[PDB]
């Protein structure tokens, strides 16, 4: 572990920096669809019932 | 984490229905069984049928593939090393 | 084995199809001219247009690979080693 190490780092950092995109790509769609269908906090909690279904769905 | 990423962002869900896309079509490729086949087809070198769409997914395989490929290259570098035959130590080594 | 098992598994059968089949139209792609093809195409770290689906034949295509991914990693090690080839060294260097 002494000399390779720091890609285990990386790719720790990569994944922590990748989930913060995950909420940038929910929040923008969030805001996106939330203009005319729904409103602004609620409209999150309506596709967090999407992604938490266990099946597939439209 | 792939696969929760795959299963909560909002474009990953897409229609395959080439001809003229209607409505409630869109599903993920990203089964749970699928995510271990992204992980150990990128770390193999060998590659998948499944590539990412919708950039959280894309990082993560962009960070994954920079692993898999200095572990790769680290195992190559040493590797001409190993391969040498080790004799026998002998069944003494000592007055004992 | 590989055709083999994915004649046998009952989920590389499959409806290529991607606009609604509505009866039957399910089939197994993996002959044995595109078997022997994903064995040469992951032997020579190309990588096929065929890639497995069900978990049967997934551990076919995972150990090949990393068969494959040791059977290269050991050539090119090796290789190095004679191409600088050691020249000419008769065992009389000097007076000593
Ligand atoms: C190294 C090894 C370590 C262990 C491996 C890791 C663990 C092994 C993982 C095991 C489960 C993952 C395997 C694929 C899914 C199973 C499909 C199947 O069996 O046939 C099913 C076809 O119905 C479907 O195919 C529905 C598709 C479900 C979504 C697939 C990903 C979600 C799995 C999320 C997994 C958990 C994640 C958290 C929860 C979100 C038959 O349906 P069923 O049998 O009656 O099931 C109830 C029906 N229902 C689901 C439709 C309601
Ligand atoms: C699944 C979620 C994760 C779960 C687990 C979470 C865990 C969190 C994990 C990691 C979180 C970060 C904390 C650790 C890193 C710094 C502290 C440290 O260890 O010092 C290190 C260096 O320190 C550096 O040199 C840091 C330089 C930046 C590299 C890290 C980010 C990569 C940059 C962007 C690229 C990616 C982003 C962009 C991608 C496209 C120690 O080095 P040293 O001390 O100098 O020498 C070694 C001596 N010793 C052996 C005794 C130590
Ligand atoms: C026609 C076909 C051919 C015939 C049929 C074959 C039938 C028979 C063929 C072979 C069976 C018997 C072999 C004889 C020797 C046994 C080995 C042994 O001794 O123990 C070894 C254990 O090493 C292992 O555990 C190897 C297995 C690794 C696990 C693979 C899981 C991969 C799944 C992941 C896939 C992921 C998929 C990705 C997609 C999700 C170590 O011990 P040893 O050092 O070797 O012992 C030497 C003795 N000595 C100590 C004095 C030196
Ligand atoms: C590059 C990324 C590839 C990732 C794959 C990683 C796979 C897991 C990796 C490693 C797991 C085991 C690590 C121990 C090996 C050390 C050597 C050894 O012990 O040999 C000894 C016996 O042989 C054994 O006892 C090993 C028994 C398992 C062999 C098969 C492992 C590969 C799994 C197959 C799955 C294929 C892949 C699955 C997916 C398709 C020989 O005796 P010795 O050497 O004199 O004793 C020294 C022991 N010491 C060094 C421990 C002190
Ligand atoms: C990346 C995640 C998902 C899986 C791997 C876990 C990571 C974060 C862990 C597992 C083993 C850990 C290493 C184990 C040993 C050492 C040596 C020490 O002197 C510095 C820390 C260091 C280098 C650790 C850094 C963090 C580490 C690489
Ligand atoms: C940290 C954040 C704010 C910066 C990155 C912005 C991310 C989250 C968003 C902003 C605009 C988004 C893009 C908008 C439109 C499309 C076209 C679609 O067919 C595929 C997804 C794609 C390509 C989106 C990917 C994600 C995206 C790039």
């Given at each position: ?6 890609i285990?780092?990386?790719l720790?950092?990569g994944?922590v ?10 929040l923008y ?14 409209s999150?909690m ?5 992604m ?7 | 984490?792939?696969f ?17 896309p209607?409505?409630?079509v869109?599903?993920?490729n ?9 992980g150990?087809?990128?770390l193999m ?20 593939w920079?692993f ?22 002998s069944?003494?080594?000592?007055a004992?």
């Amino acid at each position: 572990v002494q000399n390779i190490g720091g890609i285990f780092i990386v790719l720790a950092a990569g994944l922590v920096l990748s989930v913060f995109v995950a909420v940038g790509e929910f929040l923008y769609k969030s805001k996106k669809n939330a203009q005319l269908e729904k409103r602004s906090f609620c409209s999150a909690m309506v596709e967090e019932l999407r992604m938490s279904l266990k099946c597939q769905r439209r | 984490v792939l696969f929760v990423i795959a299963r909560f962002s909002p474009y990953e869900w897409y229609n395959p229905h080439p001809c003229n896309p209607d409505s409630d079509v869109v599903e993920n490729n990203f089964t749970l069984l699928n995510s271990f086949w992204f992980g150990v087809g990128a770390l193999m070198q060998q590659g998948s049928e499944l590539m990412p769409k919708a950039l959280s997914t894309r990082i993560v395989g962009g960070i994954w593939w920079f692993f898999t490929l200095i572990i790769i290259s680290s195992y190559t570098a040493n590797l001409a090393a190993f391969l040498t035959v080790e004799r026998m130590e002998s069944p003494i080594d000592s007055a004992d």
